[PDB]
Amino acid sequence: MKTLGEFIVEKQHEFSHATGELTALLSAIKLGAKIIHRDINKAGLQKLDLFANEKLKAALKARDIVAGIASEEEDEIVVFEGCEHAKYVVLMDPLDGSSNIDVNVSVGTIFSIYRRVTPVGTPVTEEDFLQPGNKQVAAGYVVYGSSTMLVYTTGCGVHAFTYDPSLGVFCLCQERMRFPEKGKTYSINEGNYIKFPNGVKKYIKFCQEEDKSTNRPYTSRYIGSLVADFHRNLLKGGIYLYPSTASHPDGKLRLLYECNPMAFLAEQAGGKASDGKERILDIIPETLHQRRSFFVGNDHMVEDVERFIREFPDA
Amino acid sequence: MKTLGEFIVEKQHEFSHATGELTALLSAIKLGAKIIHRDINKAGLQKLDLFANEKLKAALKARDIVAGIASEEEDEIVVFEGCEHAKYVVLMDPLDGSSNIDVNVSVGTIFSIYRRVTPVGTPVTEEDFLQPGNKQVAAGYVVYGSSTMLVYTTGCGVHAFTYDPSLGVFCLCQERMRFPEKGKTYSINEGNYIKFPNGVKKYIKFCQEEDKSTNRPYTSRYIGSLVADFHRNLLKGGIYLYPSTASHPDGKLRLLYECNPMAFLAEQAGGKASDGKERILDIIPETLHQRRSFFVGNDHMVEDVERFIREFPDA
Amino acid sequence: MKTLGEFIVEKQHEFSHATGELTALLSAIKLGAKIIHRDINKAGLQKLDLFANEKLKAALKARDIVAGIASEEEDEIVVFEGCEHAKYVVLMDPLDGSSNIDVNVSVGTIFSIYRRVTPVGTPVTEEDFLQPGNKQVAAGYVVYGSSTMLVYTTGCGVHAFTYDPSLGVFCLCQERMRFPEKGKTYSINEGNYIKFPNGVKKYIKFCQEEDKSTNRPYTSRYIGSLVADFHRNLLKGGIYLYPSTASHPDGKLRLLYECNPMAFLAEQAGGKASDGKERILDIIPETLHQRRSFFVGNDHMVEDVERFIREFPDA
Amino acid sequence: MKTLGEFIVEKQHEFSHATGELTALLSAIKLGAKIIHRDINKAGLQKLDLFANEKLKAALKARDIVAGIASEEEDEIVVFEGCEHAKYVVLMDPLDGSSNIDVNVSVGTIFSIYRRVTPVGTPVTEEDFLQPGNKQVAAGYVVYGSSTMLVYTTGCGVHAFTYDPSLGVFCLCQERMRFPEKGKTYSINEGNYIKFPNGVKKYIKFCQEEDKSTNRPYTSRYIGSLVADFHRNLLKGGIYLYPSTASHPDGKLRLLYECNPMAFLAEQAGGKASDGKERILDIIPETLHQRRSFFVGNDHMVEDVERFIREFPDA
Ligand SMILES: O=P(O)(O)OC[C@H]1O[C@](O)(CO)[C@@H](O)[C@@H]1O
Ligand SMILES: O=P(O)(O)OC[C@H]1O[C@](O)(CO)[C@@H](O)[C@@H]1O
Numbered sequence A, B, C, D: 001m002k003t004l005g006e007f008i009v010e011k012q013h014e015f016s017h018a019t020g021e022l023t024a025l026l027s028a029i030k031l032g033a034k035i036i037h038r039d040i041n042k043a044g045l046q047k048l049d050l051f052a053n054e055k056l057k058a059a060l061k062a063r064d065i066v067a068g069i070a071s072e073e074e075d076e077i078v079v080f081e082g083c084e085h086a087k088y089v090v091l092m093d094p095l096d097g098s099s100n101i102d103v104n105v106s107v108g109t110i111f112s113i114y115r116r117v118t119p120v121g122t123p124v125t126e127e128d129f130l131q132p133g134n135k136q137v138a139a140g141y142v143v144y145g146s147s148t149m150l151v152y153t154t155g156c157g158v159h160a161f162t163y164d165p166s167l168g169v170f171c172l173c174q175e176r177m178r179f180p181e182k183g184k185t186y187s188i189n190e191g192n193y194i195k196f197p198n199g200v201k202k203y204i205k206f207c208q209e210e211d212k213s214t215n216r217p218y219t220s221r222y223i224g225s226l227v228a229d230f231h232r233n234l235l236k237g238g239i240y241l242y243p244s245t246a247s248h249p250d251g252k253l254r255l256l257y258e259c260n261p262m263a264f265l266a267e268q269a270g271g272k273a274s275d276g277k278e279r280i281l282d283i284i285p286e287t288l289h290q291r292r293s294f295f296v297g298n299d300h301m302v303e304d305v306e307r308f309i310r311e312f313p314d315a
């Protein structure tokens, strides 16, 4: 057995050889993950979003390694007074999958880490949080399911760890997660069918046709939590979709707090992530809360999606 | 705080005043649930079906209160040698939601309890396990999610309990679960669209139309675990569907191990459960492994389903 | 692995064949033990006496199997209104070893169970709690140490169980605890030397002489918690002593809440328990809070003690 | 609530400002402590010495921060191949209190940390492990009792932390532990009376005299585990003694693995630690396994001991 902490030490070349700093960063994360886990595992015994947001924020600050944060909850960025010397910033979705807490369904936490652009010693600015996804130095998520797992990447593969309540530590369970060769599952909220772009509606029809030669019809799976659907699709192959519609002309997902970190993780696992036309990671952020259409998973599935959008324009 | 054990004592009138026996029955269940939980919570750190099956079987026998069992795993019934004096039989689905274990997604355990028809002192026979669902004296399930919960009924409401790892006990969290007045979520594997009965395909179209006056289009949610989708729908309202198709002419779900206990639970919560035409609980079992189409959840939703099947016959 | 609950079922002949009632009795105990354990295991993260007293009292009442209780904390007995139909009474020392909580040292819980003398339907009276120790139908203790263990007897041996946090259940670890053939450890508060009876002072000198032929000098061990010193001595052999002195002319230990249950346990393990002259279990209680000199452990050691008291009278 | 990890960060001035290295050091310790804790908490469900030794050894090496270790178990020192670049060495007593495991009594782990004398890049030698106790840069212990606690010092006070199973983290419970003004408890194995030095026998008599003006007679407490007796005495005041005798002419305790770290901790808490004549920390080690008489606790008590040895020479 090998712990997350030991693993970080062992992989000295990752994270630009700044091992000591990665350790501090993930230490903040796992602590926050442990705290949230405790409250969720006894939720039965909206409000949790705030709790998660507060605990993760306090933890990151206590490591004295982050200059400031950006939360899906927060309207403005949060500058850590006394941390001006820090050279890292973190964007996060404290509790992804709000509609699942009360129903004992999987929810998660997403984080994205960037190296600041503004001079050390100075307070960070939105400039530091509006960099394209391709500049992230680290990304990962925490899934709170039957078991609690932490998944992350620095650019050298995707590593997953499972929390062991018996020990109180995160243990390595898979060092190199990769999407299998082919996917046979699509994850989308099909109730929103009539409002999806014509290309997406076509892909859905594509997915339901009878073609044993290509594993069709695919299976449908949609938990309602980006983190949990992604995690399953990554292990078993599949694609997750959340296109634009009436309620969300530019999609529902946040480009910086959700799309970018998951996109970085998908790409590092040999998958693909796009807004249906361009690479998520190369999009230049316009605003902190910018939303974006999102399609991620096995490379061939996302491609089929882009093709259908191409051949059937106009939503 | 009140424990499951204390609650059982307090409700002396339920279970036909045989309090001492209910206690023993649920004691077997929660122990099995605790054992399985432990292995699942560290699954990361098919095979689990066997483990769950063995642990639940051994636990029920050790209470010396059950004459024998029937498992979705077992081909034949299991007679407990030395328990001929027992007057209860139990049918179970040890681990519902096989495809979810490896992906850290919710799975569950389902149990159904019947009073034997054959004379005590004698070994039980299939006759004891082929009684209609309306004869069950108890039914419930265990959901292994972010938290582990046990839900059951004896005919006087549906009671849910949440396991507290800190204490090592199940605690009452909701004494009277009821479906809310209206449902706005449907749970079905839409990838199997083309093979569903025409009436079901119509209902799906119904679900996706724009009619704010009736909360349409509904939201789509499908975890892939009967226990977890049911649980969510029960708390938030909704309907779960698994009709017949090519791969399963009579549906996929087992009538005795899955449909009946969930049907008993749905009805006790003010909901409805049918095979699309008749009441699940009144169906006279033909065989131990009989499968059946299944539609369960809010009463009005299941009715809409029955109506569409009525107006559009032939699958 | 076998649980406490399963073990009770398996031993149908013990407790006068009233299996169902023993189960309810120990269920109250283990629940109280689990609750206390939780608060103690995070004590760092006098007051606990009250907490323990309240939790055990509430638990016993909730099983609707006990007519009333007597606590070392309580001045008067506690009659359970609505439990007049109960035929059992319980005397207890909720938290034995007060001076150990703040120092992270072992403490315990002691319980004694009697069958009432007064007619059912009527409220219990001190008469029910003043019966000699030889009438107990059950006795045991819970030790909260590196691990939490429950030890008890009904008259057919001493059984010990260890709590498994991973499972949340008590598991059988030893079905027949017996003192080894010989003891080589004495447990007494030697700082109180000058005030001990002359016979006890002689025994202490005896214990420190050089006589390899009899394993002397013995080893000295004194944790400060009756439960923990007893438990160790029972497994490794030894004797525990708490004689009379200035601060306590009749000893410090309570005859009914401490001496009797431990005496019943010691005798069932092949050991001996006396006040230095007579058998603890045959003493006829004079008052609820009666104190008594107490010497318990390996039979030969207690005998040596009685002999020295005999040969050197006057304290 | 503040974690051990956060506390270390917050106290940047301690440990010679080498914060990052202290963090790695204690991370190895707490992990080993968590692993051992798990096996001990289910011991019921000699051998543990080896387990503890192996787990702590593997953990320290995995942090790639220690050049090598010295264990009370090991005959020779253990050089970490591939860690020649490390500048720290650690001496340890993996499982102090062997005779307590089987009896569910408190046991502990002791560690001592030194900065090497030999050039980096080179393999460490006994020279690095034979430095006087006054050169330690860190010392502490882990007590496995009703709760699991970690206590340590770098020269700026004694800090204690309690492990929270609910969270899986160590939390600060006391930042500045100090012996109270006066002690009233002595901890010694009195069964070995006749073989103790005359001065010690006199002190024991001193301890048992009647002198309310000085809190005499003192109370006697002796758990049999150096870690647990020390911990209690530190919180409540008291003195622990283990002098020389026949079985151990130079005492039983190891000078480097036991006496030095506890001596450093006692002094940092305002207490005193000596071999009955000189300061433990200033003794120049002669051999790796050198034993030494040891007296530690409240300053005035140890002084009384030194005085009696002075006035009554010859053991
Ligand atoms: O309820 P809907 O419209 O399917 O949206 C669910 C999605 O929204 C989120 O909760 C927010 O990102 C995701 O976790 C999830 O994929
Ligand atoms: O993979 P499919 O065809 O959607 O079937 C999933 C269903 O099968 C089961 O796993 C077996 O009953 C259910 O738990 C679940 O609802």
Ligand SMILES: O=P(O)(O)OC[C@H]1O[C@](O)(CO)[C@@H](O)[C@@H]1O
Pocket: C096, C097, C098, C099, C189, C224, C225, C226, C227, C242, C252, C253, C254, C258, D219
């Ligand atoms: O502090 P003293 O006088 O040794 O008394 C300790 C004894 O008192 C009790 O705390 C009360 O029974 C026992 O648990 C323990 O054996």
Ligand SMILES: O=P(O)(O)OC[C@H]1O[C@](O)(CO)[C@@H](O)[C@@H]1O
Pocket: C219, D096, D097, D098, D099, D189, D224, D225, D226, D227, D242, D252, D253, D254, D258
């Ligand atoms: O059994 P004895 O001779 O009292 O020795 C016990 C002492 O030995 C050790 O086990 C070894 O250091 C200490 O933990 C304890 O104080």
